[PDB]
């Protein structure tokens, strides 16, 4: 029971898992469908070229990735940087979580263990007493926690960082991947440099990109996935903005818990909200919190004074 | 015994397993029989083309996937989107189950554990008494559960989501894969764009799709599998519509259980039906429910007042 | 001892294992000897064709698999559907077993556990008594089981399903694989569709199938294996038709067991036969059934009244 | 608890992990994108060359990697030494850590175990006494440790070695990888040696490097990663320069601990700072340090003389 | 504690690990960069040769590896024997260690176990006595060990063998790999034997070695690594030449240990030095040697007569 503590809500965990796995899935798709068919470019070299010269033209145009529209010099860099760039995004998706693992895990774990121990002690004391009432240690600890703003700060910072990263991805896709999104074929010239005076090669060679459809699908999948993901992040952020009133009558099962929950009204930015959410996520400790859930469900002289 | 609890019926589990594994099996078949023979297209380039130019024509026609019937511009997109699209379907098949894992598992598990503990206590009390009769806690809990509509809502929503996804797959197959289901060969033109003024290539190049038979088999397998799967989902949905009368005499083994089962008649949309189905699936707890099964089987002064 | 219970006879288990593994072995052989040498077809394209045009003719004739005998239009589909079709057969071989796992395993396991517990109790009682005689619970349970027809129905249905599937495979092989069993080479025309007006290709191109011998060997192996397998299924079916008289004197070791075995004569379609077969398969529980085997072997005042 | 001791701060551990994994990640990228497309060079051999002669020219120019600008003889060695050189860097990143594992781990571990044992003993003594005050062993050990300069020397040496290695990498990149950073194509002559009198090959053959973009990306990633990493190393170095005053009131929980912490002011180069940092990293030993954290948090007659 | 005994110093272990792993790392590099690009030779066969004849010339010149400078017949064997030769070196690096594992491990382990048992017994006796003084068994054993010269002989022989092997590698590199270290291209004649009268092939064919740079890097890495490794071996050898005076005051913690350490001065070739080094490496047995380390550190009426 003690070792089964969860440091995050299941919704937040699954959101992080999706936001990390989707870029890696696209990475696997790219590295599987890119180098299993050669290179993502095929160049229509003239007939008089040998096979080696055609391969050289292919490699040179793949490396240059320049457009010679006519002098316009538009570039098509993203098609070659599509995997690696997304890799950075993956690392970005793993940046706040590590922060959460190195800024709130120890304090939250210690507080949760202390709170669960005090809850077990209070339950045992109530069991003995039904057959002294108030806790000064818990009251002082709750009064202190109602003033600190550490865990709430870490939570809001993590969510804001994730939202900012998603917005940055939106800006990247909407600024770099729509001026190229309809480029089927492009000209390419290898008449720059030492081969300038050569007359054996044409001035302009057309080449069509093979992986255009794959790139389009990857971009659309990314934007759709992050559009689906953002509202859940918004909901997880606004969950802290509303107090845990839905379980207030639950705290009524013990008048001491009610006194701890006296004057819960106030500004919802405090450690208390996070603690309440985590204990709600931990309402199945071994059997005792299950009994608490049963009694609060049936509550909605009670149960002949708790079976005496 | 406690750790061996099952959160779903074996029929529902096997249905989910089939509905998830079949798209993945088709994915494996597609990625195995598609890129082990090159690309799923072969283009009859003229004899004067070199090998590199023929490969360029092949890649360009594979990417474009356009038809120039004669100006008609029908497309043949699904043959290139057949795997990826089905992948979404796979994710869809995994969408409701996660919902079931994040909307009913904790409450159902807690209720099942509490019910099994109370059943063990009642069995021990009856064993002591045969050698006080009524339970107020169980009566109140059953009265409360007869009013709630949470687990029934989750079950019906999951089944409805699965049925809706199957219907959507039916619509997709019947709207996109029959206008292409008899396309052996198609024309393709690379005379669009920079190569417009080139006179070294023909205006129309015919190409025949290699993976036509594989695509046909995949579509037929999908439709047949989901046709086989839908009636079992219908049966699992209608199981809730009929009360668990088949075991009513079983509840007669203890008059307290009969009183709990008093007035079972009513509208069958309640948590009680799901609880009854799960306890029926859990009639082999350690040895005691086995003894209950033996006694109810032989029942169909009884057994000299339960061996005194 | 309790966890080592077997839910099927070793002969039935090995028959199922063979019937499942043989199609998968043939699948492995097909996918290993088919795509390790290219495609199972080689087409004698004329000399004037380039390599790309020859490959296109190869792929087109492989996909079409048509015969233009001369207009006759016989097809040679099975050579391309040989693996996938057999895969269905494999699933068919796994269909009844799952039925057996979802229609008789729980009831049989519960009954076997109860019977073994009662046998241990009766052995202990006899050991105490040799140094009250009749069991009413066991007598009533055996009387009830002599009337039910569930496990016998499941067993007969499983065996009938397996036999029907084998007969269907026989019909498939004898109706589809003998009109093709001597097709070495076949004509193939790609002059259908857009290439109709082309004069660069011949009207008829001959192609010889590479995997003819492999297909012949696979078909012969399948028919031989299922011919070897069917009589064992017949024997397993007829085993139920004869009562377990071979161990009747074994039941004489205890007169209570004889009274349970009183009036064993009757129609052999009952749960009792299956229970007797399974307990015969479980005559080595820990040491006690071994002692029973020793005493019944030596039986063929006995053993000075069981060593007093 | 005893076996869960940590020998380094989480920030230092993650910094070392990044500094080791990044070169290995670049190594994997290089060996994956270099030999999956042949060799990182394509040479425009003339048309009259056969395929074997073209391959020989390719290999010779790849091995020579010389430039014949016109006699200038600039070399382009790094493009061929890019992986192996970075491998040395990886080993360099693993050099100080091994030093830390072979110069401070045993003494630090022994001191930490002794200190934690004495802390447990002092806590037990205080618990007994609240319901003799000073420790001479701990006082003498702290007085001795305030004079030694071993662990501080090892820590500063490790950080200085890492900083020096990073500076060396900076110098290497800024001295070797900017005179080549814009070399797309280069001439290459195989008319040196035995082929000097041959007239079948040209005097100068142009070749363009395929992996130019990959090399550029690798260099930029390396410099950016180490720029991000250096300030954290600076912070970890300057952490020792400031005394652990933030927890001084924590030492006030026991006046004996305060007396141990008497005259903490002084020059911050001593083993005491490292010991304080490690015990701060170990403020969650089993439950007792958690209670200490709770009491020091709530402190900011106290707690009715520690619950009496 | 008993099972955690170390049979070698960490420095010696890491030196052996490096000296074994470096040749294997070079082996992996050679077999990875040699046969992933064909063969380490490319021969400029004339244009009139077909591809098969060019491949035959390539293979023949690779096998012969002869030089026909002009009749000089210098050979270039090492480029083909570079991996296999180094493999012998690897085995050589594993030769002395096995000797150390089969000439000193059992006796050293037995002596260390006996010594640690006697040390524990003496510590317990001192603990009892502080609240008979001399050991005759230990005194006699130390007197006997001061005369034997077995473990010292094995240690010196192992170090001398490693040094001799390193010197042999130095001689090999300085005698075989500098007359070839600047061979880019070499002539090769296949006009020896049956093809002597053939007029279809030239008399001399030039070939350039592809793996020249790789061989150069391997040789330089080997020489640099062994240059770095030799001084540590020298230090490990000279460590035995100086007595363990640095811990003499440590032996003063017990006057019995001092008497055992009486007359430590003498010629440093004895088992006693190795035993002292190993016990110094084992000063963290469970907790007791840690306490000894603490007391000897704080020593630099003592500690109120060891806390009485
Ligand atoms: C965190 C990762 C975020 C990376 C941000 C990339 C920013 C893109 C570069 C700035 C865009 C810009 O200045 O305009 C473009 C120029 O880019 C260019 O000239 C081409 C830039 C090529 C490098 C950028 C892609 C590599 C990024 C990979 C980073 C990975 C490092 C961390 C692992 C368009 O200009 P134009 O093309 O129209 O005019 C070319 C005429 N000559
Ligand atoms: C959830 C997944 C469900 C995806 C739903 C796909 C809908 C199909 C597109 C709409 C159909 C439509 O508008 O008409 C077609 C146009 O499609 C087109 O023009 C081609 C559309 C190409 C993209 C669609 C396939 C990719 C889907 C993959 C989604 C994966 C993302 C999540 C992982 C036929 O028009 P026409 O061809 O006759 O006329 C072409 C003349 N120019
Ligand atoms: C359960 C699996 C059992 C599958 C049963 C297959 C039945 C074979 C089709 C019916 C036979 C038939 O009607 O006559 C043939 C026509 O078949 C044809 O025209 C060719 C049919 C091609 C599709 C059948 C093979 C694919 C089966 C794979 C099923 C897998 C789905 C489940 C995973 C001979 O007619 P003919 O050739 O002489 O005249 C062609 C002139 N145009
Ligand atoms: C620790 C690893 C650090 C390695 C340090 C490498 C130093 C680079 C060599 C010195 C630079 C130098 O002297 O000037 C260059 C000459 O280098 C040259 O002539 C080419 C040197 C080729 C070998 C260096 C690369 C291999 C390094 C791998 C070491 C790995 C060993 C440990 C695993 C430029 O002169 P120039 O090119 O302009 O004039 C050529 C006219 N002929
Ligand atoms: C322990 C391993 C140590 C191996 C020691 C190798 C010694 C090298 C051979 C002796 C050197 C020598 O006699 O002079 C050379 C002759 O070698 C030659 O004629 C070529 C010798 C070819 C075989 C040597 C390389 C294989 C070694 C592999 C051993 C592995 C076995 C254990 C696993 C130079 O003479 P030249 O070339 O100038 O004149 C050729 C005119 N015809
Ligand atoms: C090959 O065709 C090109 C036109 O793209 C021409 O410039 C070149 O001279 C031709 N070479 C030969 C050998 O025919
Ligand atoms: C090759 O044939 C095509 C006809 O498809 C023709 O347009 C082209 O000029 C021909 N080229 C040569 C070099 O024969
Ligand atoms: C090649 O031979 C075929 C006969 O199969 C003939 O129809 C075609 O015209 C020939 N083409 C050439 C270029 O010789
Ligand atoms: C091939 O062209 C080269 C010019 O690069 C010339 O030196 C050589 O003699 C030519 N050889 C033949 C056989 O045409
Ligand atoms: C090819 O060239 C070689 C010169 O290296 C000459 O000896 C041989 O006779 C030539 N053969 C032909 C068929 O031109």
CA E305 to chain centre: 47
Distance, in Å, from the CA atom of B204 to the CA atom of B188, rounded to the nearest integer, reads: 6
Considering only the beta carbons, identify the residue of D54, D206, D298 that sits closest to A140: D298
Task: Give residue D62's region: left, alpha or beta (phi > 0; psi -120 to 50).
Answer: alpha
Compute the distance from residue A182 Cα to the ligand 6 centre, in Å: 32
Compute the distance from residue C14 Cα to the ligand 2 centre, in Å: 50
Other C-beta atoms closer than 10 Å to the C-beta of B5 total 15
Distance, in Å, from the CA atom of D43 to the CA atom of D62, rounded to the nearest integer, reads: 9
DSSP E6-38: -SS-HHHHHHHHHHHHHHHHHHHHHHHHSTTSS
DSSP 8-class letter at D77: T
Distance, in Å, from the CA atom of A37 to the CA atom of A211, rounded to the nearest integer, reads: 10
Where does residue D26 rank: exposed (0-12), middle (13-18), buried (19+ CB within 10 A)? buried
The encoded tokens of residue D239 equal 């952490």
Other C-beta atoms closer than 10 Å to the C-beta of B6 total 11
Sign of CA dihedral A272, A277, A283, A285: negative
Q: Under an 8 Å CB criterion, which residues of E touch D?
A: 10-11, 14, 36-37, 42-47, 49, 51, 54-55, 58, 184-187, 204, 206, 208-210, 212-213, 217, 284, 287, 290-291, 293-294, 297-298, 300, 303-304, 307
Other C-beta atoms closer than 10 Å to the C-beta of A158 total 22
Distance, in Å, from the CA atom of B187 to the CA atom of B166, rounded to the nearest integer, reads: 35
Other C-beta atoms closer than 10 Å to the C-beta of C256 total 18
D46, D53, D203: which to mutate for ligand 9, most atoms within 8 A of CB? D46
The encoded tokens of residue A90 equal 């993956």
DSSP 8-class letter at D66: B
Sign of CA dihedral E129, E133, E137, E143: positive
Resolution in A: 3.9
Q: Which of A248, A284, A285 is nearest to A264 (CA)?
A: A248
Residues A63, A76: contact at Cβ < 8 Å?
no
Q: Which ligand neighbours the alpha carbon of B44 most closely?
A: 7
* Cα separation of the two ends of chain E: 28
Distance, in Å, from the CA atom of E49 to the CA atom of C28, rounded to the nearest integer, reads: 44
Residues D132, D82: contact at Cβ < 8 Å?
no
Distance, in Å, from the CA atom of C65 to the CA atom of B212, rounded to the nearest integer, reads: 13
Q: What is the nearest CA distance from E148 to chain D, expressed in angstroms?
A: 32
Residues B82, B215: contact at Cβ < 8 Å?
yes
Distance, in Å, from the CA atom of D227 to the CA atom of D229, rounded to the nearest integer, reads: 5
Other C-beta atoms closer than 10 Å to the C-beta of A189 total 17
Closest ligand 9 atom, CA of D49?
A: 1
Specify the 3-state DSSP secondary structure of A65: coil
Considering only the beta carbons, identify the residue of E10, E42, E186 that sits closest to D60: E42
Question: Look-up: residue for tokens 């701890």?
Answer: A260
Contact pairs from chain B to chain C, CB under 8 Å: 81
Residues A210, B61: contact at Cβ < 8 Å?
no
Determine whether the shortest distance from the Cβ of C105 to ligand 3 is under 6 A.
no
Distance, in Å, from the CA atom of D253 to the CA atom of D263, rounded to the nearest integer, reads: 17
Helices (H), chain E: 10-33, 51-64, 78-93, 95-103, 105-130, 136-145, 151-176, 212-239, 248-251, 255-260, 271-281, 288-299, 303-307
What contacts A304, CB < 8 A, 6 or more positions away?
A: B136
Determine whether the shortest distance from the Cβ of E88 to ligand 5 is under 6 A.
yes
The torsion of the CA quartet E291, E297, E303, E307, rounded to 10 degrees, works out to -10
Residues E45, E54: contact at Cβ < 8 Å?
yes
What contacts E97, CB < 8 A, 6 or more positions away?
A: E16, E158
Distance, in Å, from the CA atom of A50 to the CA atom of B203, rounded to the nearest integer, reads: 25
Distance, in Å, from the CA atom of E246 to the CA atom of E239, rounded to the nearest integer, reads: 12
Return the bridge partners of D185, or none: D208
Where does residue B205 rank: exposed (0-12), middle (13-18), buried (19+ CB within 10 A)? buried
Other C-beta atoms closer than 10 Å to the C-beta of D52 total 22
Among A38, A110, A139, the strongest candidate for a mutation testing the D interface, having the largest count of D CBs within 10 A, is A110
Among A294, A295, A301, the strongest candidate for a mutation testing the B interface, having the largest count of B CBs within 10 A, is A294
Give the β-pairing of B205-208 and B42-43.
Answer: antiparallel
Where does residue C2 rank: exposed (0-12), middle (13-18), buried (19+ CB within 10 A)? exposed
Question: Look-up: residue for tokens 């469900």?
Answer: A297
Distance, in Å, from the CA atom of E27 to the CA atom of E221, rounded to the nearest integer, reads: 12
Distance, in Å, from the CA atom of A173 to the CA atom of A216, rounded to the nearest integer, reads: 11
Test B45 with C53 for CB contact under 8 angstroms: yes
C-alpha to C-alpha distances, B117 to A291, B110, B132, nearest whole angstrom: 11, 11, 17
Considering only the beta carbons, identify the residue of C59, C102, C137 that sits closest to B10: C102
Among D42, D70, D72, D187, the strongest candidate for a mutation testing the A interface, having the largest count of A CBs within 10 A, is D42
Specify the 3-state DSSP secondary structure of E188: strand
Q: Which of E249, E238, E244 is nearest to E278 (CA)?
A: E244
Sign of CA dihedral A68, A73, A78, A80: positive
**Chain E: touching chains (3 or more CB pairs < 8 Å):** D
Return the bridge partners of C304, or none: none
Residues A41, A207: contact at Cβ < 8 Å?
yes
Which segments of chain D are extended strands (E)? Answer: 42-43, 185-188, 205-208
* Residues of chain B contacting residue A208, judged by C-beta atoms under 8 Å apart: 56, 59-60, 63, 190
Return the bridge partners of B187, or none: B206
Residues D288, D295: contact at Cβ < 8 Å?
no
Distance, in Å, from the CA atom of E271 to the CA atom of E150, rounded to the nearest integer, reads: 7
Q: What is the nearest CA distance from D148 to chain A, expressed in angstroms?
A: 32
Residues E292, E250: contact at Cβ < 8 Å?
yes
Specify the 3-state DSSP secondary structure of B116: helix
Experimental method: cryo-EM
Compute the distance from residue A46 Cα to the ligand 6 centre, in Å: 8
Where does residue D84 rank: exposed (0-12), middle (13-18), buried (19+ CB within 10 A)? middle
Q: Which of B190, E252, C135, E259 is nearest to A208 (CA)?
A: B190
What contacts D86, CB < 8 A, 6 or more positions away?
A: D23, D26, D27, D30, D218, D222
Where does residue B37 rank: exposed (0-12), middle (13-18), buried (19+ CB within 10 A)? middle
Q: Nearest-CA residue of chain B relative to A44? A: B53
Q: Nearest-CA residue of chain A relative to D285? A: A110
* Cα separation of the two ends of chain A: 28
Closest ligand 4 atom, CA of D88?
A: 33
Ramachandran angles phi, psi of D26, nearest 5°: -65, -35
Which segments of chain B are extended strands (E)? Answer: 42-43, 185-188, 205-208
Question: Look-up: residue for tokens 């939202």?
Answer: A163
C-alpha to C-alpha distances, D52 to A58, B193, D102, E211, nearest whole angstrom: 20, 37, 55, 18
Compute the distance from residue D183 Cα to the ligand 1 centre, in Å: 19
Task: Give residue C242's region: left, alpha or beta (phi > 0; psi -120 to 50).
Answer: beta
Specify the 3-state DSSP secondary structure of B211: coil
Kindly report the protein residue whose alpha carbon is nearest to atom 11 of ligand 10. E48
Sign of CA dihedral D128, D134, D140, D143: positive
Write out residues with Cβ below 6 Å of ligand 4: D 73-75, 77, 81, 84-85, 88; E 217, 220-221, 224
Ramachandran angles phi, psi of C244, nearest 5°: -80, 60
Return the bridge partners of C43, or none: C207
Residues B112, B282: contact at Cβ < 8 Å?
yes
Specify the 3-state DSSP secondary structure of B233: helix
Return the bridge partners of B28, or none: none
| Chains E and B are in contact, defined as 3 or more C-beta pairs closer than 8 angstroms | no
Compute the distance from residue E191 Cα to the ligand 10 centre, in Å: 16
Distance, in Å, from the CA atom of D231 to the CA atom of D224, rounded to the nearest integer, reads: 12
* Cα separation of the two ends of chain D: 28
Among E59, E211, E297, E303, the strongest candidate for a mutation testing the D interface, having the largest count of D CBs within 10 A, is E297
Where does residue A133 rank: exposed (0-12), middle (13-18), buried (19+ CB within 10 A)? exposed
Q: Which of D263, D262, D267 is nearest to D240 (CA)?
A: D267
Residues B75, B65: contact at Cβ < 8 Å?
yes
Distance, in Å, from the CA atom of E17 to the CA atom of A296, rounded to the nearest integer, reads: 65
Compute the distance from residue C94 Cα to the ligand 10 centre, in Å: 69
Determine whether the shortest distance from the Cβ of D202 to ligand 9 is under 6 A.
yes
Q: Nearest-CA residue of chain E relative to D80? A: E213
C-alpha to C-alpha distances, C266 to C249, C260, C273, C274, C279, nearest whole angstrom: 18, 14, 11, 15, 20
Which segments of chain A are extended strands (E)? Answer: 42-43, 185-188, 205-208
Residues E100, E152: contact at Cβ < 8 Å?
no
The encoded tokens of residue E186 equal 């070499």
Test A284 with B53 for CB contact under 8 angstroms: no
* Residues of chain B contacting residue C64, judged by C-beta atoms under 8 Å apart: 184
* Residues of chain E contacting residue D64, judged by C-beta atoms under 8 Å apart: 184
Compute the distance from residue A14 Cα to the ligand 2 centre, in Å: 29
Test B294 with C53 for CB contact under 8 angstroms: no
Specify the 3-state DSSP secondary structure of D43: strand
Q: How many Cα atoms are found within 13 Å in the side-chain-facing hemisphere of D134? A: 7
Q: Which of D165, D153, D138, D130 is nearest to D308 (CA)?
A: D130
Kindly report the protein residue whose alpha carbon is nearest to atom 25 of ligand 4. D81
The helix or strand, by DSSP H or E, that contains position C43, with its residue range, turns out to be strand C42-43
Q: Which of E38, E23, E6, E16 is nearest to E209 (CA)?
A: E38
Residues E106, E40: contact at Cβ < 8 Å?
no
Q: What is the nearest CA distance from D6 to chain A, expressed in angstroms?
A: 14
Considering only the beta carbons, identify the residue of B47, B210, B293 that sits closest to C110: B293
Sign of CA dihedral E293, D157, D105, D109: positive
DSSP 8-class letter at C187: E
Kindly report the protein residue whose alpha carbon is nearest to atom 14 of ligand 8. C48
Kindly report the protein residue whose alpha carbon is nearest to atom 28 of ligand 4. D85
* Residues of chain A contacting residue D14, judged by C-beta atoms under 8 Å apart: 98, 102
The helix or strand, by DSSP H or E, that contains position C97, with its residue range, turns out to be helix C95-103
Ramachandran angles phi, psi of C307, nearest 5°: 50, 25
Return the bridge partners of E188, or none: E205
Other C-beta atoms closer than 10 Å to the C-beta of E179 total 11
Distance, in Å, from the CA atom of C120 to the CA atom of C1, rounded to the nearest integer, reads: 12
Test B56 with A37 for CB contact under 8 angstroms: no
Give the β-pairing of A185-188 and A205-208.
Answer: antiparallel
Return the bridge partners of D187, or none: D206
Compute the distance from residue B30 Cα to the ligand 2 centre, in Å: 20
Q: Which of D42, E239, C108, C247 is nearest to B284 (CA)?
A: C108
Distance, in Å, from the CA atom of B45 to the CA atom of B51, rounded to the nearest integer, reads: 9
């Amino acid at each position: 029971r003690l070792k089964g503590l969860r440091l995050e809500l299941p919704l937040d965990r699954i959101v992080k898992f999706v936001a990390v796995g989707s870029p890696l899935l696209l990475m696997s798709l790219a590295f599987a469908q890119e180098f299993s068919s050669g290179s993502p470019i095929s160049c229509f070299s003239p007939s008089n070229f040998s096979i080696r010269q055609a391969a050289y033209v292919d490699s040179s145009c793949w490396d240059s990735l320049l457009h010679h529209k006519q002098d316009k010099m538009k570039s098509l860099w993203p098609h070659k940087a599509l995997p690696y760039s997304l890799l950075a995004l993956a690392l970005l998706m793993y940046l706040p979580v590590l922060l959460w693992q190195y800024a709130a895990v120890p304090a939250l774990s210690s507080d949760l263990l202390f709170i669960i121990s005090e809850l077990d002690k209070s339950y045992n004391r109530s069991i003995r007493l039904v057959q002294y009432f108030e806790f000064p240690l818990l009251e002082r600890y709750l009064a202190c926690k109602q003033r600190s703003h550490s865990l709430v700060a870490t939570y809001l910072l993590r969510n804001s960082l994730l939202l900012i990263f998603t917005s940055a991805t939106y800006l990247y896709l909407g600024h770099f991947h729509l001026d190229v999104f309809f480029q089927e074929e492009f000209s390419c010239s290898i008449k720059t440099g030492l081969l300038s005076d050569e007359t054996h090669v044409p001035n302009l060679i057309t080449c069509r990109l093979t992986s255009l459809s794959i790139f389009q699908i990857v971009s659309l999948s990314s934007v759709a996935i992050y559009t689906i993901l953002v509202p859940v992040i918004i909901y997880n952020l606004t969950r802290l903005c509303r107090w845990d009133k839905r379980l207030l009558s639950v705290y009524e099962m013990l008048p001491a818990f009610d006194l701890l929950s006296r004057k819960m009204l106030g500004c919802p930015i405090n450690d208390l909200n996070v603690i309440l959410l985590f204990l709600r996520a931990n309402i199945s400790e071994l059997i005792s919190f299950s009994w608490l859930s049963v009694l609060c469900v049936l509550k909605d002289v009670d149960f002949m004074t708790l079976l005496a």
